[PDB]
């Protein structure tokens, strides 16, 4: 339709923003513990999928918790300590989150450049309708 380009770019921007927000939240909760109701904090990731309308935009179905084992730290003085006196610290890969943020920023800038070019082309298109 020559106008689904805007939809594709907007979906890409929204997905990149979601992924960046997830990475930022993980970085903020890198060294947290004992969230609500006492359950240990676990990191989360996002999964990108394409919308087969062929070629289509990107979407994020749901946020998936990481299955990597939590860090078990010996500290009996914490009420969260089990019979072995261990507390469950969250699994956060700082380098992984930095790389994810870098990738999200680069994809966002590429998509905004594509939007700029297509907007210029579409503005120039209407000059022939007179």
């Amino acid at each position: 339709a020559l106008l689904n380009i805007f939809d594709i770019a907007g979906s890409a921007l929204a997905a990149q923003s979601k992924r960046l927000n997830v990475a930022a939240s993980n970085l903020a909760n890198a060294d947290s513990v004992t969230g609500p109701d006492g359950q240990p904090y676990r990191a989360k990731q996002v999964v990108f999928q394409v919308d087969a309308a062929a070629t289509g935009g990107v979407k994020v179905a749901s946020v998936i918790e990481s299955q990597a084992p939590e860090k078990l730290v010996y500290e009996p003085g914490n009420p969260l300590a089990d019979a072995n006196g261990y507390v469950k610290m969250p699994n956060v890969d700082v380098v992984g989150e930095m790389v994810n943020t870098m990738s999200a920023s680069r994809s966002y800038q590429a998509n905004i450049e594509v939007l700029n070019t297509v907007k210029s082309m579409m503005l120039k298109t209407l000059t022939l309708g007179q």
């Binding site: 907007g10 929204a14 609500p36 109701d37 979407k59």
Partner: peptide, 21 residues
């Protein structure tokens, strides 16, 4: 349903409980 679509009713208000009630 899908984010960014059109809905006839507002979403419930957001809250961030520090501790569970």
């Amino acid at each position: 349903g899908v984010p960014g679509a059109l809905s006839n009713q507002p979403a419930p208000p957001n809250e961030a409980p520090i501790a569970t009630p």
